[PDB]
Amino acid sequence: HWGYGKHNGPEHWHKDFPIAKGERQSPVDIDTHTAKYDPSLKPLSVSYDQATSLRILNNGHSFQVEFDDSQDKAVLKGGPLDGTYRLLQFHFHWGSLDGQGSEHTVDKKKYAAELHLVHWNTKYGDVGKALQQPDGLAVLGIFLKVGSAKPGLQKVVDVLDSIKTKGKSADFTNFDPRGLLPESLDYWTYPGSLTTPPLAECVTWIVLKEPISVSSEQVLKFRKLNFNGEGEPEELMVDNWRPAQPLKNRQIKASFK
Ligand SMILES: COC(=O)c1cc(S(N)(=O)=O)c(SC2CCCCC2)cc1Cl
Ligand SMILES: [Zn+2]
C-alpha cells in the first residue's frame, strides 16, 4: 500500500517505516560547493563485461533490469568501497515533466530522471542479509537529462510496452549496462539509505557527476507505463521519486577537482 500518490506517497511512509525520519536517509541535495574533494578516494571500478541480464520487470513503482548475481560477474569495487559488490538490478526514477524526476539534486537542480544500479556486498552472502548492514549495498546513481538519445537505452525503452503493467516481466538477456554509463566516473559519495520502503540505512551512495542524455521520445516511453495492474483505474507511472531528505550529520565527498 505505499506508493507515490497524495495519500500513500513519501510524506506518509514514516507511519509504516519510522526509519524514514532516521539519521542517514536518501536521497539528499548535493551542495557542490560544500562537498569536499577527498584525494584518498579511489577511482570507481565498474566491471560489467560479464553481466548477465536475465529479465526486465514492472514492479508497480518502477521497472527493473535484473541480473544473475549468483557469481561475481558484474561487480563494483574501489571508489569509497571496501570489498566487492555484485550488480543485482537497475531501475529508474522519473518525472511527469522534464524539470523533475531525479531523487538526488545538485545545488537544488532536479534532473528529468535518475538511474540506480543496485549492488550488494558479497561479504554478506545474499541481499537480504546485506540489507541489514550499514555497508550492505552500493548504489550507483546516474542523472538523465533530456536532449539527444542514449542509444544504449533503446533496447530497454522498446520492451516497456510489454510490461505496461505491474507484475509483467520479460526475458532481457544480453543487455549490456555499460551502454547506460556517461564518459566520466567522477562522483560524489555519502552514506545513506534505500529511497523506497523499507528505507533501510544500508547504502553507500555513489552519484556520478556527469549526466547521460536521453531523448524526449525515450523518456516519454517511461511515462507511458502504469502503476496499476492489468485491470484498475489507469494511473500513469510518473513522479516515482522521493524528495531530498535532511543531510543531518553527514559529509558528501567528491572524487574530483
Ligand atoms: C521506484 O523505486 C523502485 O522501484 C525501487 C527502488 C530502490 S532504491 N531507490 O534503490 O532504494 C530499490 S533497492 C532494492 C533492490 C532489490 C534488492 C533490495 C533493495 C528497488 C526498487 Cl524496486
Ligand atoms: Zn532507486
Author numbering: 4 to 260
Question: What text appears in the publication on this structure?
Answer:
The carbonic anhydrase (CA) family (CA, EC 4.2.1.1), consisting of twelve catalytically active human isozymes, performs the catalysis of reversible hydration of CO2 into bicarbonate and acid protons. Since it has been observed that CAIX isozyme is highly overexpressed in numerous cancers, it has been postulated that compounds inhibiting CAIX may possess the anticancer activity and may be used in tumor treatment. Here we have designed a series of compounds, methyl 5-sulfamoyl-benzoates, which bear a primary sulfonamide group, a well-known marker of CA inhibitors, and determined their affinities for all twelve CA isozymes. Eight crystal structures of CA complexes with compounds are presented in this study: 9a bound to CAI and CAII, 3b, 3d, 5b, and 9a bound to CAXII, 3b bound to CAIX and mimic-CAIX (mutant of CAII containing amino acids in the active site as in CAIX: A65S, N67Q, I91L, F130V, V134L, and L203A).
The ligand positions were similar except for the shift of the ortho cyclooctyl group. Nevertheless, the native CAIX bound 3b 10-fold more strongly than the mimic-CAIX. The crystal structure could not answer this question with certainty, but the differences in binding affinities between CAIX and CAII were even greater: ΔGintr = −56.7 kJ/mol to CAII, ΔGintr = −67.4 kJ/mol to mimic-CAIX and ΔGintr = −75.0 kJ/mol to CAIX.
